[PDB]
Amino acid sequence: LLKVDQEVKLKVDSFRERITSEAEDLVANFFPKKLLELDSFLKEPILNIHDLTQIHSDMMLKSNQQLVDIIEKVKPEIRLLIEKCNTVKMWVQLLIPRIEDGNNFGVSIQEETVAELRTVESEAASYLDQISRYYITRAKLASKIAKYPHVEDYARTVTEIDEKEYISLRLIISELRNQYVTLHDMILKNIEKIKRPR
Amino acid sequence: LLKVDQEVKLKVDSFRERITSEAEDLVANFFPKKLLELDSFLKEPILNIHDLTQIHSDMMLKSNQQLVDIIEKVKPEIRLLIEKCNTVKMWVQLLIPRIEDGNNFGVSIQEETVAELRTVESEAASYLDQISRYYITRAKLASKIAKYPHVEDYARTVTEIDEKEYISLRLIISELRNQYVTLHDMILKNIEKIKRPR
Amino acid sequence: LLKVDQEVKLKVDSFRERITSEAEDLVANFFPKKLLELDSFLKEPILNIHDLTQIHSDMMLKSNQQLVDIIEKVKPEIRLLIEKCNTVKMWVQLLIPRIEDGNNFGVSIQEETVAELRTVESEAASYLDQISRYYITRAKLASKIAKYPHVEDYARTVTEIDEKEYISLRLIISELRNQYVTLHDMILKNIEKIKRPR
Amino acid sequence: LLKVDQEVKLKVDSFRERITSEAEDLVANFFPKKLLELDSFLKEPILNIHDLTQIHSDMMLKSNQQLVDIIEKVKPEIRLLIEKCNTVKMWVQLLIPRIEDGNNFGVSIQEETVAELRTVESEAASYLDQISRYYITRAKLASKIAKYPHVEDYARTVTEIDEKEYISLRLIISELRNQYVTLHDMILKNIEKIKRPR
Amino acid sequence: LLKVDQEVKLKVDSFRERITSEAEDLVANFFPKKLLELDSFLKEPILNIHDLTQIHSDMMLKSNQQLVDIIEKVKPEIRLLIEKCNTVKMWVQLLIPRIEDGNNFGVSIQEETVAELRTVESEAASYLDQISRYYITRAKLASKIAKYPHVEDYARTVTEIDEKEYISLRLIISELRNQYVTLHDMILKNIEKIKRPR
Amino acid sequence: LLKVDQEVKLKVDSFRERITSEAEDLVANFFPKKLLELDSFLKEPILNIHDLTQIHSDMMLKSNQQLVDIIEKVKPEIRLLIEKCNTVKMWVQLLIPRIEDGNNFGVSIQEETVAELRTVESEAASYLDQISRYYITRAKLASKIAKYPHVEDYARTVTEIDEKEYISLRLIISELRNQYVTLHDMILKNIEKIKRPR
Amino acid sequence: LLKVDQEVKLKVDSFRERITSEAEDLVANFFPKKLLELDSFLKEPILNIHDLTQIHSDMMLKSNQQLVDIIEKVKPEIRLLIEKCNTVKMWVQLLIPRIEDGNNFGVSIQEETVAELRTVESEAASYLDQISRYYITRAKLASKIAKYPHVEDYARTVTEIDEKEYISLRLIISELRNQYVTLHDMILKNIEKIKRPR
């Protein structure tokens, strides 16, 4: 064993408690409330447009406002899952016990929970990257529309990128709603083994 | 266990019921009706042209309107599988039980069902990317036909891309019809274990 | 179980029978007739040229018309295998039974058959891509022959690409004939287990 | 055995003791104090800005100074984990015993600890690379904003990169804090087998 | 079972007999004679030049005649192995029996034989690609010797590529000779199980 | 067995004895002396600069002298480990016995030791590549600072590369010291089985 | 079995005997003599220069003669290992017996010997590619030194590539010597099972 100073140890123990209280309130209060808010956004008219010709913008020059406005609403939700998933993962990580030869089935559930939260955080970060990739790809296609006015397929590439972003951003909002419901159910179904592994 | 507020819990239970009702009607009613519509599209003349020299457009400048018209009908069908597959996957996920050492054969069927729905949803998204890649590739080749008028293989590259897109778009419509029938049969054959795993 | 409307169910059952009837005739009557036609093409003089200096075109400018003429014959055959393999794969997929703990040896033969048909369909689609890559690569090499008239190796690169495409297109016709005979023998040597898995 | 000079052996033993002393203080005193400092930074206002439009710089030309100031604070903390993790890994490596057929469960804990410390050191080095990629990518986008003033998406690409860097730097400060608490708990829980494997 | 037309079946059986006769004569007569011809080429002076400075061409402009002449002899031999290996692979493939739970050791030898022939046919096709890559790389290096006359290393890159091609082409003639002897020995040693698997 | 000429055998035996003597002195006397020298360099002021803004050079034009001076000291130490690790690997490789069915636990230690030395020798060679990548990356960024004088992120990219190189070169010196102590401990602990495997 | 013509069979048997005699003389006379010649080269002054600033050439324009002179000696030695390893691999391949269910331990030693010789022959071919990459990389860096005279790091990149090539060429000469001694010991230690597997 290595000796640890008591005054710092008491401050570390208060951090471990605060992380425990937040992770439990996030799983049992925030994850359920956030699922209801994200479900309500998907029932709004902006995210349910049948003719995708409506979302098209005339074009080099301007950026799609109908997409810029939806992205501005989606980006705050992706940032909240990444932050809240990190607090929940740390809580499960600090409940994993001393490595021992037997009674390691509960530890596997705790290790499976930490691996799911790492997948959710990585998928959420990819969604933020896809929004940046849309702006760079539309920006390049706009430069090519001006450089080669004769080719009509350059213009069709901008309309295709805009329509695919509308489908992709609506799918990201459905996936964020699905991740909050899936993580709440799994953590609550497997709570006794996650809280008390052995 | 972590305590959950009852009023928000009652709202979460209504979401879980709505997702169950929709997923059951999509597998039982929509998936079979969509298979009949996609099979009817494949017997229409626009998708059954023996001489692919009739799909050719003279060319920089214009974009094939025989292909732009088919892509316009294919893209709405690809978007419906991605959205409907996501609702059915969530229904199976919310049925997966507390992790336990034994009686996990039914859980495997529920986990195999979610893995197939993820493969179907990823393949459908790839089909939408392929339509965008056609427009960028034809656009680049159209720019080269103008830059190098002398090379006659630049023109043959545009005729080849148009013929490969026609064969590819008909294969996407047949694959989308195959995914609706294959997913209906598997979910209906394996329903008792998916609904009641243990 | 989920209830299914009877009138649509009768229509789904009629589709399942048509896919069964077509798939049985393709394995039994079309795969054997197509092997005999593809074998006869390989004995025609155009696909059996010993001196490969006779398939050479003088060159920027023109595209080989000895190669363009063979590609025009090879491309329709690659398209027929992709469409017919898709109908046979679906017939086998609709015969795979409810997942159960035992008696899964026949299911493995049905799953192994679907995996072979997926490999044949992917290899056939790759062959269509190889023909498009020939045109883009020859087109670029032709642009370089005009940009750098001094380098003698740019011209040798065009003669090499034309000779390799002749060897490659003849290998594709042999591989397509081999896939028809191989799929016919495996499907009718393993029919009893594929039709009746358990 | 190979004979080793005693005077150099005495000096190697003092190095081996100094590394043991430092690693034990780093795990029991520094790792806990650093978690407390990194948690306090996350509660400071600079890292808690709700409207991410307040971190936007007007733009070619100038670099974000709200981001340059945070990177100047984040980069020293990443450098301390990489150096301190290397001292702790060497201590665990020098406790691994002579390879023997049995009683190798504790050696697995020591080998698992060295693998976690190698993962922490690699992840920390990646975070330093991500800060360099932000500057090169913003520099390139700034050059394109000057080259193509007409395209409005080039400007949106810079605001998007600045907002993603703010979210990423707050995540690096949280991950660095999480690595100090995770490594302190694992090494202290598993100390008896890490110090005395057999 | 599926019924097959007798007249088309009789023609399919004649094809299977012709493939069997050719594959048996290729393994027993052609593979041994080809190994003797390829061994005789390797003892000729053209492929046994000690001073590799003698195979150098002065250079943009001219391509190496000494190497163009050897590639002209090597390329026909690579084409014969690819075509003849395809006939031998099909004969072994048409001998693989109905899938059964036991007595599957001979089937493994037949499957190992088809996998080796697929490796030989793929390695041979790569050798044809390597010859095309030499011409494109020498062409690019020749364009750079003219663009940057001052840099002496551009000239040394052409002499190095020519010497490496001489070594590579002699290794390809030895590998083609080694594939003929290796495939003859394995197929004759393992014939009883390949011809009669069970 | 194959007969070997005695006079050449006696000379081969003298080589194997000389390699054995060197490998034993290198593990017993040089690995320990080199670890003390590399540890002393890490306590020197040049490798321990807290303000990393003191290692910054004004900038196209000049290269960082503070970094050039350290790379000149680091590169000789990386070269000595690569050369000495090769003599120690050959000594262990030439002690591996005739392949036999049993008593292969000691051979595994000898095979595991040769694999660690291959990892050290490959990692050390990578460090020499990283020093070359610094010069090419700083050189490209310096070309861009002159081409695009307006963008201030190009200048921040050079200061960042210089700071990451200082952190990296101090990490290479600590890793080289750690490899000498780790290799000496493992080879000396596992000596009886490495020298006499069975 | 397939009948084989006796006269061609007698000629194949003489080829098989010639490969056996050559392979046994290479393992027992050439491999030992080549290890001694390559060890003597490593003790010559040209490959043992302490100050690597003495191998530097002033520079666009000239190529390093001190390196062109060492590469001219190293390249003939890499070529001999590739050709001689191919003769030894074929001898071991032609001794591998008919596949049988049991008594397959010796076949594993013969299969391990063919795999080692394939790794040695692939590594040697890569060393020849590395000599070509030095020339193309030095040539490109020399072109950039003339294009951007202001950037001093372009010049430091040529001095670094030259010093790394000197270290790499001495490492290739030691690796070629190590491969001759390692292959002689493994083949002579494991000869009885390689010559008579069962």
- CB contact at 8 A, F76 and G168: no
Q: C76: closest CA among C155, C142, C169? A: C169
E162 touches G: beta carbon within 8 Å: no
State the Cα–Cα distance between residues C81 and C124, nearest whole angstrom.
7
Is residue D89 packed enough to be buried (19+ CB in 10 Å), middle (13-18) or exposed (0-12)?
buried
Contact (Cβ atoms closer than 8 angstroms) between residue F159 and residue F182: no
Closest among D66, A138, G140 to E140, alpha carbons compared? G140
Tokens of F123: 């990692």
CA atoms in the 13 A half-sphere facing the CB of B154: 21
Residue the block writes with tokens 């990190």: A86
Q: What is the dihedral of CA E177, E178, E183, E188, to 10 degrees?
A: 90
**From CA G116, how far away is CA A183, in angstroms rounded?**
50
- How far apart are alpha carbons D181 and D31 in whole angstroms? 7
Amino acid at C48: N
Q: Which of C163, C173, C172, C159 is nearest to C130 (CA)?
A: C172
Distance, in angstroms, between E65 CA and closest chain C CA? 11
Amino acid type, C95 = L
- Cα B155 versus chain centre, distance: 32
- Angle value at C-alpha A152, between A151 and A158, nearest 5 degrees: 110
Q: Are G110 and G197 in contact (CB under 8 A)?
A: yes
> Subunits touching E (CB < 8 Å, at least 3 pairs)?
C, G
Alpha-carbon span C9 to C12, nearest angstrom: 5
Range of the domain at C16: 1-198
Q: Specify the DSSP class assigned to residue F64.
A: P
Cα A75 to Cα A48, A80, A114: the distances in Å are: 18, 9, 24
Nearest Cα to Cα of residue B162 among G65, C132, A114, A142: C132
CA distance C35 to C26: 12
CA angle A33/A34/A35 to nearest 5° reads: 90
Please state the φ and ψ torsions of residue E153, each to the nearest 5 degrees.
-65, -25
Residues of E in contact with G75 (CB under 8 A): 52, 163
With an 8 Å Cβ cutoff, is B192 touching chain A? no
* D contact residues 108-137, partner F, Cβ 8 Å cutoff: 128-129, 131-132, 135-136
- Rounded distance between C-alpha atoms, residue E166 and residue E171, angstroms: 9
Please say whether the beta carbons of A191 and A175 come within 8 A.
Answer: no
Residue A124 to residue A79: CA distance in whole angstroms: 8
D82 to chain A, closest Cα gap in Å: 21
Residue A61: other Cβ atoms inside 10 A: 13
Nearest to G96 by CA among E198, E96, E112, F103: E112
- Convert C141-189 into a string of H (helix), E (strand) and C (coil): HHHHHHHCCCCCHHHHHHHHHHHHHHHHHHHHHHHHHHHHHHHHHHHHH
- Kind plus residue range of the DSSP H or E element containing G83: helix G65-93
Residues G166 and G55: beta-carbon distance below 8 Å: yes
The type of residue at E178 is N
Interface residue F82 vs chain G (CB under 8 A): yes
Q: CA-based angle A198:B4:B6, to the nearest 5?
A: 145
Determine, for residues A190 and B2 on separate chains, whether the beta-carbon distance falls below 8 Å. Answer: no
What is the per-residue DSSP string for E103-143? --HHHHHHHHHHHHHHHHHHHHHHHHHHHHHHHHHHHHHHH
Q: How far apart are CA A157 and CA A166, in angstroms?
A: 14
Cβ E21 vs Cβ E178: under 8 Å: no
Sequence-distant (6+) residues with CB within 8 A of D35 are A12, A15, D177, D180, D181, D184
Q: C182 φ, ψ to 5°?
A: -65, -45
Rounded to whole angstroms, the Cα distance separating B141 from B161 reads 10
The C-alpha atoms of residue D79 and residue D75 are separated, in whole angstroms, by 6
Q: How many helices (H) and strands (E) does chain F have?
A: 6, 0
Judge C/D contact: 3 or more CB pairs < 8 A.
Answer: no
Which experimental method was this entry solved with?
cryo-EM
Inter-chain CB pairs, B–C, below 8 Å = 108
Which of B153, B164, B194 to mutate to probe the C interface, most C CBs <10 Å?
B153
Chain F and chain G share a number of CB contacts under 8 A equal to 107
Q: What is the resolution of this structure in A?
A: 2.8
d(CA A124, CA A90) in angstroms, rounded, equals 17
Residues 6+ apart with CB under 8 A from D105: A101, D193
Which are the contacts of F170, defined by CB distance < 8 A and separation ≥ 6?
A: D83, F42, F47
Q: Tell me, what DSSP letter sits at residue F62?
A: P
CB atoms within 10 A of CB G74: 22
Place of tokens 């929004």: A131
Whether residue A139 and residue D154 make contact (CB cut-off 8 A), yes or no, is: yes
Which residue type occupies G198?
Answer: R
Inter-residue contact A85 to D175 (CB < 8 Å): no
In angstroms, the CA F185 to CA G168 distance is 28
Q: What are the distances in angstroms from CA B82 to CA A54, A174, B110, B176, C74? A: 21, 11, 19, 10, 35
Residue D90 carries which side chain, given as an amino acid letter? M
F57, burial (CB in 10 Å: exposed 0-12, middle 13-18, buried 19+): middle
* Chain-centre distance for alpha carbon G174: 11
Could you write out the DSSP letters of every residue in chain B?
-----HHHHHHHHHHHHHHHHHHHHIIIIIHHHHHHHHHHHHTSGGG--S-GGGS---------HHHHHHHHHHHHHHHHHHHHHHHHHHHHHTT-----SS--HHHHHHHHHHHHHHHHHHHHHHHHHHHHHHHHHHHHHHHHHHH-SS-SHHHHHHHHHHHHHHHHHHHHHHHHHHHHHHHHHHHHHTHHHHHS--
Nearby residues of A144 by Cβ (< 8 Å), 6 or more positions away: A151, A154, A157, B139, B143
User: Is residue C31 a contact partner of residue C184, using CB atoms and an 8 Å limit?
Assistant: yes
The reply to whether G49 touches chain F by the CB within 8 Å rule is no
Count the neighbouring beta carbons within 10 Å of the beta carbon of residue F45: 6
Q: Does G149 touch chain E (CB under 8 A)?
A: no
User: What distance in Å separates the CA atoms of residue B170 and residue B193, rounded to the nearest whole number?
Assistant: 35
CB contact under 8 A, A1 and D163: no
User: DSSP letter at G47?
Assistant: G
CA proximity to D36, closest of A24, A7, A83: A7
F95, F96, F99, F101: CA torsion to nearest 10: 100
Q: CA-to-CA distance for C51 and C76, rounded, in angstroms? A: 27
Q: Find out whether D158 and D64 touch, Cβ atoms under 8 Å.
A: no
**Within an 8 Å CB–CB cutoff, is residue D4 touching chain F?**
yes
* Chains A and D touch each other (3 or more Cβ pairs < 8 A): yes
CB atoms closer than 10 angstroms to residue A8: 15
D128: nearest Cα among D64, D172, D94, D185: D172
Closest chain D C-alpha to F157 CA, distance in angstroms: 6
Does D27 touch chain A if contact means CB atoms closer than 8 Å? yes
Asked if B190 contacts C98 with a C-beta cutoff of 8 angstroms, the reply is yes
What residue type is assigned to position B161 of the chain?
A: I
Helical axes G31-42 vs G65-93, angle rounded to 10° = 160
Residue located via tokens 């030395």: F117
| Cα(C52)–Cα(C98) distance, integer angstroms | 56
Q: Which chain D residue's Cα is nearest to A97?
A: D189
Measured between CB atoms, does C32 come within 8 Å of chain E? yes
Q: Which residues contact D172 (CB under 8 A, 6 or more apart)?
A: D74, D78, D127, D130
State the Cα–Cα distance between residues B84 and B81, nearest whole angstrom: 5
Residues of D in contact with A12 (CB under 8 A): 32, 35-36, 181, 184
Using alpha carbons, list the distances in angstroms from residue G125 to A191, E131, G79.
58, 16, 8
* Identity of the residue numbered A67: L
Contact present, E43 and E111 (Cβ < 8 Å)? no
CB contact under 8 A, C188 and E131: no
Q: What 3 state SS string does chain C have?
A: CCCCCHHHHHHHHHHHHHHHHHHHHHHHHHHHHHHHHHHHHCCCHHHCCCCCCCCCCCCCCCCCHHHHHHHHHHHHHHHHHHHHHHHHHHHHHCCCCCCCCCCCHHHHHHHHHHHHHHHHHHHHHHHHHHHHHHHHHHHHHHHHHHHCCCCCHHHHHHHHHHHHHHHHHHHHHHHHHHHHHHHHHHHHHCHHHHHCCC
Burial class (CB in 10 A: 0-12, 13-18, 19+), B22: middle
Of A3, A61, A97, nearest to D189 by CB-CB distance is: A97
SS3 of chain A: CCCCCHHHHHHHHHHHHHHHHHHHHHHHHHHHHHHHHHHHHHCCHHHCCCCHHHHCCCCCCCCCHHHHHHHHHHHHHHHHHHHHHHHHHHHHHCCCCCCCCCCCHHHHHHHHHHHHHHHHHHHHHHHHHHHHHHHHHHHHHHHHHHHCCCCCHHHHHHHHHHHHHHHHHHHHHHHHHHHHHHHHHHHHHCHHHHHCCC
Q: How far apart are CA A142 and CA A60, in angstroms?
A: 4
Q: Can you spell out the DSSP letters for F130-183? A: HHHHHHHHHHHHHHHHHH-SS-SHHHHHHHHHHHHHHHHHHHHHHHHHHHHHHH
- G179 in contact with F at a CB cutoff of 8 Å? no
* Rg value, chain C, Cα: 23
Tokens of E169: 């082409």
- F84, F29 Cβ separation under 8 angstroms: no
Interface contact C9, partner B, CB < 8 A: yes
F132-156 burial code (b ≥16 CB/10 A, e <16)? bebbbbbbbbbbbbeebeebbbbbb
Q: Do D94 and F182 touch (CB under 8 A)?
A: yes
Task: Please give the distance of CA G4 from its chain centroid, rounded to a whole number.
Answer: 37
Give the C-alpha distances (Å, rounded to integers) separating E60 from B119, E150, E155, F57. Answer: 52, 14, 10, 42
C159: nearest Cα among C132, C141, C143, C133: C141
Number of domains in chain E: 1
Give the closest-approach CA distance of D4 to chain F in angstroms: 5
- Measured in angstroms, the CA of C107 and the nearest CA of chain E are apart by 12
Structure tokens, F29: 């006397």
Residue G22 in contact with partner chain E when CB distance is under 8 A:
no
The two three-digit tokens of residue D83, written as one number: 């150096």
Question: Rounded to 5 degrees, what are φ and ψ at C7?
Answer: -65, -45
The burial of C31, by beta-carbon neighbours within 10 Å (0-12 exposed, 13-18 middle, 19 or more buried), is given as: buried
Residue with tokens 């630049």: B154
Host H or E run for residue G106: helix G105-147
Q: Which residues of D touch A104 (CB under 8 A)?
A: none
Pair C94, B185: CB distance under 8 Å: yes
Residue G151, number of CB atoms within 10 A of its CB:
25
E73 touches chain C (CB under 8 A): no
Q: Which residues of C touch B160 (CB under 8 A)?
A: 131-132, 135
CB-count exposure of residue F47 (10 Å: 0-12, 13-18, 19+): middle
Contacts of C68 in chain B (CB under 8 A): 156
Distance in angstroms (rounded) separating the CA atoms of residues A13 and C6: 64
The two tokens of residue G70 are 């060492």
What letter does residue G46 receive in the DSSP assignment? G
Q: What are phi and psi of A49, to 5 degrees?
A: -110, 120
Residue D59 near residue D67, CB atoms below 8 Å? no
Q: Is G102 exposed, middle or buried (0-12, 13-18, 19+ CB in 10 A)?
A: exposed
F156:D63 CB<8 A: yes
Closest CA to G33 of G187, G173, G172, G181: G181
Contacts of A68 in chain D (CB under 8 A): 156
Answer whether B140's CB lies under 8 Å from A140's CB: no
Neighbouring CB atoms inside 10 A of C15's CB total: 17
Contacts of E16 in chain C (CB under 8 A): 181
> b/e for E18-57, b at 16 or more Cβ within 10 A?
ebbebbbebbbbbbbebbbebbebeeeeebeeeebeebeb
* Alpha-carbon gap, residue A89 to A114, rounded angstroms: 6
Q: Rounded to whole angstroms, how far apart are CA atoms C143 and F34?
A: 59
Distance from CA of B152 to the nearest CA of C (A): 6
Length, in residues, of chain C: 198
CA distance A67 to G25: 75
Taking alpha carbons only, the member of C106, C103, C77 closest to residue C169 is C77
CB atoms within 10 A of CB D19: 19
